[PDB]
Tab-separated table of all heavy atoms in Angstrom:
chain	number	residue	atom	x	y	z
L	56	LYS	N	17.520	178.955	135.296
L	56	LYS	CA	17.948	177.579	135.172
L	56	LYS	C	18.784	177.166	136.386
L	56	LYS	O	18.597	176.124	136.934
L	56	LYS	CB	18.858	177.457	133.908
L	56	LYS	CG	18.069	177.189	132.674
L	56	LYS	CD	17.526	175.811	132.532
L	56	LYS	CE	16.470	175.690	131.481
L	56	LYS	NZ	17.024	175.751	130.141
L	57	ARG	N	19.653	178.061	136.822
L	57	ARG	CA	20.457	177.798	138.033
L	57	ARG	C	19.611	177.609	139.255
L	57	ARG	O	19.860	176.770	140.074
L	57	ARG	CB	21.534	178.909	138.206
L	57	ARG	CG	22.352	178.664	139.396
L	57	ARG	CD	23.118	177.417	139.412
L	57	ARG	NE	23.933	177.197	138.220
L	57	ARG	CZ	25.210	177.676	138.129
L	57	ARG	NH1	25.784	178.320	139.097
L	57	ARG	NH2	25.886	177.458	137.017
L	58	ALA	N	18.584	178.556	139.397
L	58	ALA	CA	17.740	178.445	140.556
L	58	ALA	C	16.980	177.140	140.553
L	58	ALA	O	16.840	176.551	141.660
L	58	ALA	CB	16.814	179.572	140.633
L	59	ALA	N	16.462	176.696	139.449
L	59	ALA	CA	15.764	175.409	139.342
L	59	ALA	C	16.726	174.245	139.664
L	59	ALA	O	16.292	173.329	140.410
L	59	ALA	CB	15.188	175.230	137.968
L	60	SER	N	17.889	174.281	139.176
L	60	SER	CA	18.888	173.220	139.453
L	60	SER	C	19.215	173.186	140.933
L	60	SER	O	19.306	172.090	141.533
L	60	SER	CB	20.126	173.420	138.640
L	60	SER	OG	21.167	172.601	139.140
L	61	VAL	N	19.442	174.340	141.575
L	61	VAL	CA	19.750	174.416	142.978
L	61	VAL	C	18.596	173.875	143.828
L	61	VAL	O	18.791	173.154	144.771
L	61	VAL	CB	20.230	175.824	143.383
L	61	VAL	CG1	20.365	175.918	144.910
L	61	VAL	CG2	21.446	176.183	142.727
L	62	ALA	N	17.379	174.328	143.445
L	62	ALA	CA	16.158	173.788	144.180
L	62	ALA	C	16.136	172.332	144.078
L	62	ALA	O	15.852	171.649	145.161
L	62	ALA	CB	14.928	174.496	143.683
L	63	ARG	N	16.262	171.760	142.916
L	63	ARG	CA	16.187	170.271	142.787
L	63	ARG	C	17.314	169.601	143.578
L	63	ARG	O	17.075	168.539	144.186
L	63	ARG	CB	16.154	169.911	141.371
L	63	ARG	CG	15.736	168.451	141.117
L	63	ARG	CD	15.850	168.087	139.576
L	63	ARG	NE	16.127	166.653	139.461
L	63	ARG	CZ	17.297	166.089	139.387
L	63	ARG	NH1	18.404	166.823	139.541
L	63	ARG	NH2	17.425	164.781	139.262
L	64	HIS	N	18.489	170.167	143.521
L	64	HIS	CA	19.621	169.645	144.280
L	64	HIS	C	19.288	169.591	145.813
L	64	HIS	O	19.648	168.581	146.490
L	64	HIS	CB	20.887	170.367	143.988
L	64	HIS	CG	22.172	169.581	144.101
L	64	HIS	ND1	22.615	168.801	143.108
L	64	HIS	CD2	23.030	169.538	145.141
L	64	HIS	CE1	23.782	168.223	143.467
L	64	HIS	NE2	24.037	168.668	144.718
L	65	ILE	N	18.758	170.702	146.344
L	65	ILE	CA	18.420	170.733	147.717
L	65	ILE	C	17.331	169.717	148.063
L	65	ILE	O	17.349	169.008	149.108
L	65	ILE	CB	17.975	172.168	148.112
L	65	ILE	CG1	19.080	173.166	147.836
L	65	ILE	CG2	17.554	172.204	149.608
L	65	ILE	CD1	20.392	172.842	148.527
L	66	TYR	N	16.321	169.540	147.167
L	66	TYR	CA	15.333	168.552	147.344
L	66	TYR	C	15.969	167.166	147.408
L	66	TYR	O	15.565	166.369	148.330
L	66	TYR	CB	14.289	168.623	146.212
L	66	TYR	CG	13.145	167.608	146.327
L	66	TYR	CD1	11.900	167.980	146.786
L	66	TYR	CD2	13.319	166.244	146.103
L	66	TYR	CE1	10.836	167.100	146.874
L	66	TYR	CE2	12.313	165.298	146.219
L	66	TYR	CZ	11.055	165.764	146.587
L	66	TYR	OH	9.984	164.847	146.738
L	67	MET	N	16.877	166.873	146.520
L	67	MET	CA	17.495	165.593	146.569
L	67	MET	C	18.314	165.314	147.802
L	67	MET	O	18.247	164.190	148.361
L	67	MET	CB	18.422	165.342	145.301
L	67	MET	CG	17.657	165.488	143.950
L	67	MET	SD	16.132	164.525	143.979
L	67	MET	CE	16.070	164.078	142.237
L	68	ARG	N	19.062	166.311	148.288
L	68	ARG	CA	19.967	166.114	149.428
L	68	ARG	C	19.190	166.444	150.695
L	68	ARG	O	18.010	166.640	150.697
L	68	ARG	CB	21.300	166.890	149.248
L	68	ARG	CG	22.326	166.153	148.486
L	68	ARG	CD	22.072	166.399	147.030
L	68	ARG	NE	23.144	165.802	146.173
L	68	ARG	CZ	22.995	165.475	144.884
L	68	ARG	NH1	21.906	165.750	144.234
L	68	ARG	NH2	23.962	164.811	144.219
L	69	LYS	N	19.902	166.466	151.792
L	69	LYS	CA	19.346	166.976	153.053
L	69	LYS	C	19.493	168.470	153.179
L	69	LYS	O	18.484	169.240	153.268
L	69	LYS	CB	19.936	166.262	154.255
L	69	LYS	CG	19.819	164.754	154.222
L	69	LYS	CD	20.820	164.109	155.210
L	69	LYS	CE	20.740	162.581	155.160
L	69	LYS	NZ	19.551	162.081	155.991
L	70	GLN	N	20.742	168.968	153.234
L	70	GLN	CA	21.045	170.374	153.109
L	70	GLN	C	22.411	170.554	152.492
L	70	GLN	O	23.311	169.734	152.714
L	70	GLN	CB	20.962	171.046	154.496
L	70	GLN	CG	22.167	170.749	155.447
L	70	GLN	CD	22.047	169.403	156.134
L	70	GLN	OE1	21.962	168.391	155.434
L	70	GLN	NE2	21.993	169.407	157.430
L	71	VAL	N	22.541	171.633	151.738
L	71	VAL	CA	23.703	171.941	150.937
L	71	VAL	C	24.059	173.422	151.049
L	71	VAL	O	23.179	174.236	151.072
L	71	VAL	CB	23.468	171.437	149.443
L	71	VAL	CG1	24.675	171.817	148.613
L	71	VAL	CG2	23.215	169.949	149.359
L	72	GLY	N	25.419	173.636	151.073
L	72	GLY	CA	25.829	175.068	151.249
L	72	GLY	C	26.550	175.527	149.961
L	72	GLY	O	26.722	174.841	148.948
L	73	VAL	N	26.917	176.816	150.059
L	73	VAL	CA	27.415	177.477	148.904
L	73	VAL	C	28.678	176.892	148.386
L	73	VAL	O	28.857	176.786	147.166
L	73	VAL	CB	27.659	179.011	149.240
L	73	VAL	CG1	28.180	179.768	148.020
L	73	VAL	CG2	26.424	179.652	149.777
L	74	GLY	N	29.589	176.388	149.264
L	74	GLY	CA	30.786	175.751	148.739
L	74	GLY	C	30.480	174.492	148.021
L	74	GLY	O	31.204	174.212	147.036
L	75	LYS	N	29.488	173.794	148.400
L	75	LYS	CA	29.164	172.581	147.691
L	75	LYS	C	28.507	172.871	146.303
L	75	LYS	O	28.739	172.190	145.324
L	75	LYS	CB	28.234	171.721	148.550
L	75	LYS	CG	28.780	171.309	149.869
L	75	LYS	CD	28.615	169.816	150.210
L	75	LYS	CE	28.928	169.538	151.585
L	75	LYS	NZ	30.257	170.065	152.007
L	76	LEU	N	27.693	173.916	146.322
L	76	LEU	CA	27.191	174.371	144.968
L	76	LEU	C	28.394	174.803	144.066
L	76	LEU	O	28.405	174.550	142.831
L	76	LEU	CB	26.218	175.480	145.059
L	76	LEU	CG	24.737	175.231	145.452
L	76	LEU	CD1	24.547	174.830	146.902
L	76	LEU	CD2	23.952	176.452	145.121
L	77	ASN	N	29.352	175.488	144.609
L	77	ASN	CA	30.574	175.912	143.851
L	77	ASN	C	31.279	174.656	143.286
L	77	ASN	O	31.648	174.678	142.080
L	77	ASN	CB	31.462	176.775	144.692
L	77	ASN	CG	30.804	178.096	145.167
L	77	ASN	OD1	29.616	178.322	144.889
L	77	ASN	ND2	31.540	178.808	145.913
L	78	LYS	N	31.496	173.689	144.156
L	78	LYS	CA	32.155	172.468	143.688
L	78	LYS	C	31.326	171.740	142.605
L	78	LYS	O	31.789	171.262	141.627
L	78	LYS	CB	32.489	171.573	144.856
L	78	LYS	CG	33.499	170.509	144.555
L	78	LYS	CD	34.207	170.012	145.853
L	78	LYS	CE	34.807	168.627	145.525
L	78	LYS	NZ	35.823	168.327	146.638
L	79	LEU	N	30.006	171.703	142.850
L	79	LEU	CA	29.142	170.953	141.924
L	79	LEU	C	29.155	171.554	140.575
L	79	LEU	O	29.359	170.901	139.550
L	79	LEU	CB	27.726	170.951	142.495
L	79	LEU	CG	26.633	170.371	141.502
L	79	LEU	CD1	26.654	168.878	141.478
L	79	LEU	CD2	25.301	170.866	141.928
L	80	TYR	N	28.879	172.896	140.443
L	80	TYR	CA	28.750	173.541	139.179
L	80	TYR	C	30.047	173.980	138.519
L	80	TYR	O	30.141	174.259	137.365
L	80	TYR	CB	27.869	174.831	139.253
L	80	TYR	CG	26.432	174.435	139.696
L	80	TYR	CD1	25.920	174.786	140.920
L	80	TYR	CD2	25.585	173.752	138.813
L	80	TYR	CE1	24.715	174.443	141.299
L	80	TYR	CE2	24.335	173.412	139.171
L	80	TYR	CZ	23.790	173.817	140.390
L	80	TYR	OH	22.575	173.453	140.739
L	81	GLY	N	31.197	173.939	139.327
L	81	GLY	CA	32.495	174.137	138.771
L	81	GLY	C	32.856	172.994	137.878
L	81	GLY	O	32.603	171.851	138.139
L	82	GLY	N	33.593	173.329	136.831
L	82	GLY	CA	34.173	172.304	135.889
L	82	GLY	C	35.690	172.383	135.811
L	82	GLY	O	36.257	172.780	136.836
L	83	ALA	N	36.242	171.931	134.735
L	83	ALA	CA	37.661	172.053	134.514
L	83	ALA	C	38.011	173.371	133.856
L	83	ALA	O	37.294	173.898	133.011
L	83	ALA	CB	38.216	170.915	133.694
L	84	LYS	N	39.171	173.939	134.214
L	84	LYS	CA	39.593	175.235	133.622
L	84	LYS	C	40.735	174.992	132.665
L	84	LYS	O	41.689	174.289	132.966
L	84	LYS	CB	40.049	176.188	134.735
L	84	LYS	CG	40.652	177.474	134.204
L	84	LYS	CD	40.803	178.505	135.306
L	84	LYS	CE	40.948	179.888	134.685
L	84	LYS	NZ	42.355	180.172	134.247
L	85	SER	N	40.592	175.512	131.468
L	85	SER	CA	41.715	175.531	130.499
L	85	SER	C	42.732	176.457	130.903
L	85	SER	O	42.512	177.681	131.136
L	85	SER	CB	41.197	175.881	129.130
L	85	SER	OG	42.277	176.165	128.230
L	86	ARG	N	43.970	175.992	131.117
L	86	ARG	CA	45.085	176.732	131.685
L	86	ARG	C	46.108	176.990	130.638
L	86	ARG	O	47.359	177.047	130.905
L	86	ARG	CB	45.669	176.120	132.908
L	86	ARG	CG	44.899	176.361	134.175
L	86	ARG	CD	45.092	175.287	135.208
L	86	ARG	NE	46.379	175.472	135.890
L	86	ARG	CZ	47.315	174.500	135.981
L	86	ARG	NH1	47.141	173.328	135.380
L	86	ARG	NH2	48.450	174.740	136.562
L	87	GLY	N	45.753	177.210	129.415
L	87	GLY	CA	46.661	177.428	128.297
L	87	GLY	C	47.451	176.192	127.927
L	87	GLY	O	46.878	175.117	127.650
L	88	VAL	N	48.770	176.328	128.050
L	88	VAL	CA	49.668	175.212	127.694
L	88	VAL	C	50.005	174.378	128.946
L	88	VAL	O	50.928	173.522	128.964
L	88	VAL	CB	50.960	175.716	127.023
L	88	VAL	CG1	50.712	176.431	125.727
L	88	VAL	CG2	51.740	176.660	127.934
L	89	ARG	N	49.236	174.605	130.037
L	89	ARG	CA	49.194	173.804	131.230
L	89	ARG	C	48.030	172.799	131.186
L	89	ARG	O	46.994	173.019	130.499
L	89	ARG	CB	49.092	174.638	132.431
L	89	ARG	CG	50.495	175.252	132.904
L	89	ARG	CD	50.355	176.049	134.137
L	89	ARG	NE	51.637	176.712	134.453
L	89	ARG	CZ	52.008	177.868	133.935
L	89	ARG	NH1	51.337	178.517	133.097
L	89	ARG	NH2	53.199	178.362	134.352
L	90	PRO	N	48.131	171.749	131.874
L	90	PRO	CA	46.972	170.781	131.925
L	90	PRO	C	45.811	171.329	132.740
L	90	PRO	O	45.971	172.199	133.578
L	90	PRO	CB	47.638	169.524	132.624
L	90	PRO	CG	48.728	170.095	133.415
L	90	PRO	CD	49.320	171.237	132.682
L	91	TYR	N	44.637	170.734	132.422
L	91	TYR	CA	43.437	171.141	133.038
L	91	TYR	C	43.378	170.755	134.530
L	91	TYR	O	44.144	169.897	135.013
L	91	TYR	CB	42.235	170.562	132.335
L	91	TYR	CG	42.052	170.987	130.886
L	91	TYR	CD1	42.905	170.497	129.908
L	91	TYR	CD2	41.089	171.913	130.482
L	91	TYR	CE1	42.749	170.839	128.563
L	91	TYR	CE2	40.996	172.334	129.220
L	91	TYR	CZ	41.773	171.769	128.200
L	91	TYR	OH	41.699	172.202	126.967
L	92	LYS	N	42.485	171.409	135.294
L	92	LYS	CA	42.199	171.075	136.652
L	92	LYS	C	40.871	171.537	137.030
L	92	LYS	O	40.336	172.473	136.409
L	92	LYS	CB	43.241	171.537	137.613
L	92	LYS	CG	43.188	173.033	137.896
L	92	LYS	CD	44.432	173.538	138.542
L	92	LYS	CE	44.402	173.482	139.989
L	92	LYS	NZ	45.480	174.295	140.669
L	93	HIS	N	40.160	170.944	138.022
L	93	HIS	CA	38.979	171.393	138.544
L	93	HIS	C	39.120	172.747	139.206
L	93	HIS	O	40.015	172.968	139.968
L	93	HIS	CB	38.347	170.368	139.480
L	93	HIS	CG	37.300	170.907	140.356
L	93	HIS	ND1	35.954	170.983	140.024
L	93	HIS	CD2	37.378	171.434	141.653
L	93	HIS	CE1	35.290	171.511	141.030
L	93	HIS	NE2	36.094	171.819	142.055
L	94	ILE	N	38.139	173.644	138.893
L	94	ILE	CA	38.044	174.958	139.512
L	94	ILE	C	36.663	175.208	139.982
L	94	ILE	O	35.675	175.032	139.270
L	94	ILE	CB	38.544	176.015	138.526
L	94	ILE	CG1	40.075	175.983	138.314
L	94	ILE	CG2	38.155	177.436	139.002
L	94	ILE	CD1	40.856	176.401	139.581
L	95	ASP	N	36.523	175.725	141.194
L	95	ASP	CA	35.245	176.013	141.776
L	95	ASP	C	34.494	177.083	141.074
L	95	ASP	O	35.170	178.093	140.552
L	95	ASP	CB	35.331	176.355	143.260
L	95	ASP	CG	35.642	175.129	144.127
L	95	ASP	OD1	35.381	174.015	143.707
L	95	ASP	OD2	36.262	175.313	145.243
L	96	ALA	N	33.200	177.134	141.046
L	96	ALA	CA	32.335	178.094	140.358
L	96	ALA	C	32.238	179.342	141.264
L	96	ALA	O	32.599	179.444	142.432
L	96	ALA	CB	31.029	177.519	140.067
L	97	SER	N	31.747	180.371	140.607
L	97	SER	CA	31.640	181.715	141.257
L	97	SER	C	30.676	181.586	142.438
L	97	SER	O	29.495	181.158	142.322
L	97	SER	CB	31.126	182.787	140.290
L	97	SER	OG	30.856	184.035	140.897
L	98	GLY	N	31.130	182.101	143.638
L	98	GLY	CA	30.383	181.936	144.824
L	98	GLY	C	29.186	182.922	145.024
L	98	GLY	O	28.214	182.674	145.597
L	99	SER	N	29.384	184.147	144.469
L	99	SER	CA	28.318	185.166	144.588
L	99	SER	C	27.013	184.755	143.925
L	99	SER	O	25.966	184.955	144.520
L	99	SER	CB	28.812	186.521	143.992
L	99	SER	OG	29.789	187.110	144.862
L	100	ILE	N	27.141	184.201	142.734
L	100	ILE	CA	25.909	183.751	142.082
L	100	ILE	C	25.162	182.635	142.854
L	100	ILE	O	23.951	182.726	142.984
L	100	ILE	CB	26.272	183.264	140.668
L	100	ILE	CG1	26.853	184.424	139.831
L	100	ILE	CG2	25.093	182.652	139.941
L	100	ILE	CD1	27.851	183.998	138.761
L	101	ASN	N	25.912	181.690	143.329
L	101	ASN	CA	25.249	180.641	144.097
L	101	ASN	C	24.645	181.141	145.369
L	101	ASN	O	23.586	180.759	145.825
L	101	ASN	CB	26.203	179.494	144.364
L	101	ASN	CG	26.590	178.719	143.122
L	101	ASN	OD1	25.757	178.561	142.189
L	101	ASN	ND2	27.808	178.304	143.058
L	102	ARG	N	25.391	182.038	146.079
L	102	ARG	CA	24.855	182.678	147.303
L	102	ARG	C	23.582	183.422	147.068
L	102	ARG	O	22.657	183.325	147.836
L	102	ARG	CB	25.932	183.463	147.978
L	102	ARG	CG	25.735	183.782	149.423
L	102	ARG	CD	26.866	184.591	150.074
L	102	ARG	NE	27.293	185.725	149.236
L	102	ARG	CZ	28.436	185.799	148.595
L	102	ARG	NH1	29.293	184.782	148.645
L	102	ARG	NH2	28.693	186.895	147.961
L	103	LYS	N	23.544	184.193	145.998
L	103	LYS	CA	22.289	184.991	145.748
L	103	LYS	C	21.223	184.099	145.206
L	103	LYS	O	20.031	184.410	145.419
L	103	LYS	CB	22.649	186.145	144.803
L	103	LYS	CG	23.538	187.157	145.449
L	103	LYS	CD	23.803	188.411	144.597
L	103	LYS	CE	24.763	189.295	145.210
L	103	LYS	NZ	24.296	189.948	146.444
């Protein structure tokens, strides 16, 4: 699923790197009794 999503994203854009995939697929992180915030996704999976 991730490979298909990345391929379609690359088709849509011109060129995209690992950091941009990390930002794209990252969501918000539950920080317990702290408020949420955006957190980047795992880089190794996107790189591979």
Side-chain angles (χ1 to χ4, degrees):
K56 276 287 165 71
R57 179 57 60 85
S60 166
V61 172
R63 194 183 151 271
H64 209 82
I65 301 303
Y66 182 104
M67 299 314 212
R68 276 85 181 157
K69 303 162 181 282
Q70 75 280 59
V71 177
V73 181
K75 302 226 191 309
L76 282 71
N77 298 359
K78 198 159 160 161
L79 171 78
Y80 296 110
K84 176 169 198 280
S85 168
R86 279 157 77 236
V88 297
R89 279 184 185 81
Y91 297 75
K92 74 197 268 194
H93 160 87
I94 287 292
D95 286 337
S97 175
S99 287
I100 294 150
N101 291 325
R102 198 177 46 251
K103 290 184 188 293

